[PDB]
């Protein structure tokens, strides 16, 4: 209570230095922590593939797509597409899709993570918890916290890494060392399986006891909670949308003084990407073995009391870890820094969403754009996004069995792959047109909604109570649909655009990867030695990542 109050007082009074901090904060945030711990408890190590593939995606971003964003001169994605394609229609629809994705993932998961952290600590149920978090974020933003966020990000990531290392040290000690994780985890099961409710009936051993292959990263391809054939490619697509299209990420990456400095920052970010496995997934399953009945229950009657949802609330593992396993005095430091990072991320998402909407939608709708009225529109947009995100919380807590990170991956894999296909085809093949790309992308969006809307209306339930969803619609994994949508939306944009030769070469000078360097005028559609050592460092870091992958795989 003292440490948390002092930390909040310091933060409010205040309101590869920024690059690494921003990259890690987006990579490993508060909602990211809680979701990673939860799915680590429910499923096992396998969720580590998410981080270990996002690492490779960050490396690919830094090595390939940052120079493309730099030579062209477009800091953001939508203006790069504006110069590449032309026409406010495609940029408008892409901004609409970005707004929807922000609402569906960023804000919703941030608020729900705050609710999970507060719910297993001082406070109340989800509604009061998110109301208090809204108050905290508002008082943060009013006092210009975002302005000093650039300086505070490095301090926050340093203290988060320090605290997470302390939690690493404490967790295996509370279990008995690394031997305890390989010894005790597979026997972690609740004592309550009676299911006094007559409708539910006696639960089979499949649900409450953990999966037998909860250790290995690579699950069964067909029948499994998280297949690896889906993992490797679907994560590539989703995280390629995440890292190579986010405006904030590219703005932070390009902020480096030189290209070699950008690559060094990417390598340091990779170092910080290899650690959150041991910091999140291991302690989540440690919290599961420590607290088997509380963390992962399967009987709905007890589950509503413990969780608030009938799924099982496997995602409350990390709040319990923080508020029990930590030393009594120091737990306030975690409960303070966790919420501070969450509030900073939420404020950044709020500002980015409002700026995007103002810059594209209301700008195209009303070309007058009175400054007072425009600011009023921005404030009303913030109000609207808060209301919609809070109204979406009951769907968020379900999240296909309570795994919060599964919800993020599902939503992104439903609506990102079309944008990824459009971007990759625009960057690779010159033939794609503005009308062709838009007409493919609208079809991809319809295809994605055709599987999202019925699934979310029907439900997911749990293993005990599956929803009355058709076998073909829900038996397909929530992430294999991203692989299907990649080669459906991209096929549509490649086929529609190929109907004619829409754009000559002069409009696409130094904007298409094929013509990386032309040294010619555009058509206006509107370290010599450090490099080898940096490449060697990247080779070493990537080899270490593969070593860990093969160790657990």
């Amino acid at each position: 209570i003292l440490v948390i109050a002092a930390y909040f007082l310091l933060v409010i009074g205040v309101g590869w230095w920024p690059v690494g901090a921003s990259l890690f904060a987006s990579n490993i945030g508060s909602g990211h922590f809680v979701g990673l711990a939860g799915t680590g408890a429910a499923s096992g190590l396998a969720v580590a593939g998410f981080e270990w593939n996002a690492l490779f995606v960050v490396l690919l971003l830094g090595w390939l797509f940052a120079p493309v964003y730099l030579t062209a001169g477009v800091i953001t994605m939508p203006q790069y597409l504006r110069k590449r394609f032309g026409g406010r229609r495609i940029r408008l629809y892409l901004s609409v899709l970005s707004l929807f994705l922000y609402i569906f993932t960023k804000i919703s998961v941030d608020m729900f993570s705050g609710a999970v952290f507060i719910q297993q600590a001082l406070g109340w149920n989800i509604y009061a918890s998110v109301i208090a978090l809204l108050g905290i974020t508002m008082i943060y933003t009013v006092t210009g916290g975002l302005a000093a966020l650039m300086y505070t990000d490095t301090v926050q990531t340093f203290v988060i890494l320090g605290g997470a290392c302390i939690l690493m040290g404490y967790a295996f000690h509370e279990v008995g060392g690394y031997s305890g994780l390989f010894d005790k985890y597979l026997g972690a099961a609740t004592s309550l399986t009676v299911s006094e409710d007559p409708a539910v009936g006696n639960i089979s051993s499949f649900c409450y006891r953990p999966r037998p292959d909860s250790y290995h990263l690579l699950r069964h391809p067909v029948t499994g909670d998280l297949p690896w054939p889906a993992l490797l490619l679907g994560l590539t697509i989703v995280s390629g949308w995440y890292w190579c299209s986010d405006q904030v990420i590219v703005q932070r990456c390009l902020a480096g003084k030189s290209l070699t400095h950008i690559k060094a920052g990417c390598i340091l970010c990779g170092y910080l990407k290899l650690t959150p496995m041991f910091l999140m997934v291991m302690p989540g399953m440690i919290s599961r073995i420590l607290y088997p009945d509380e963390v992962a229950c399967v009987v709905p009657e007890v589950c509503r009391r413990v969780c608030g949802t009938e799924v099982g609330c496997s995602n409350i593992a990390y709040p319990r870890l923080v508020v029990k396993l930590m030393p009594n005095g120091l737990r306030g430091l975690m409960l303070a820094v966790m919420l501070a990072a969450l509030m900073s991320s939420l404020a950044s998402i709020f500002n980015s969403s409002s700026t995007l909407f103002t810059m594209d939608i209301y700008t195209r709708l009303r070309p007058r754009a009175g400054d007072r009225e425009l600011l009023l529109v921005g404030r009303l947009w913030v109000v609207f996004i808060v209301v919609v995100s809070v109204a979406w919380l009951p769907v968020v807590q379900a999240a296909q069995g309570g795994q919060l990170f599964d919800y993020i991956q599902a939503v992104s894999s439903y609506l990102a792959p079309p944008v990824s296909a459009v971007f990759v085809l625009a960057l690779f093949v010159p033939r794609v047109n503005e009308q062709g790309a838009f007409w493919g992308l609208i079809g991809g969006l319809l295809m994605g909604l055709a599987r999202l809307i019925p699934e979310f209306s029907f439900g997911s339930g749990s293993c005990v109570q599956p929803s009355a969803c058709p076998a073909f619609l829900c038996g397909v994994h929530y992430l294999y649909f991203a692989i299907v949508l990649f080669f459906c939306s991209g096929l549509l944009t490649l086929t529609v655009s190929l109907c004619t030769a829409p754009i000559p070469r002069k409009h696409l000078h130094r904007l298409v990867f094929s013509l990386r360097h032309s040294k010619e005028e555009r058509e206006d559609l509107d370290d010599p030695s450090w490099a080898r050592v940096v490449n060697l460092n990247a080779l070493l870091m990537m080899a270490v990542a593969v070593f860990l992958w093969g160790f657990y795989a």
Binding site: A543, F547, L548, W549, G550, F551, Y552, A553
Partner: peptide, 25 residues
Amino acid sequence: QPWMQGLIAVAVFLVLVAIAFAVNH
């Protein structure tokens, strides 16, 4: 033991990187 699997993974993927290194050259 997992460490032999990790060593095999490193060897295989380093061989892959070395093979791909000739593409640019």
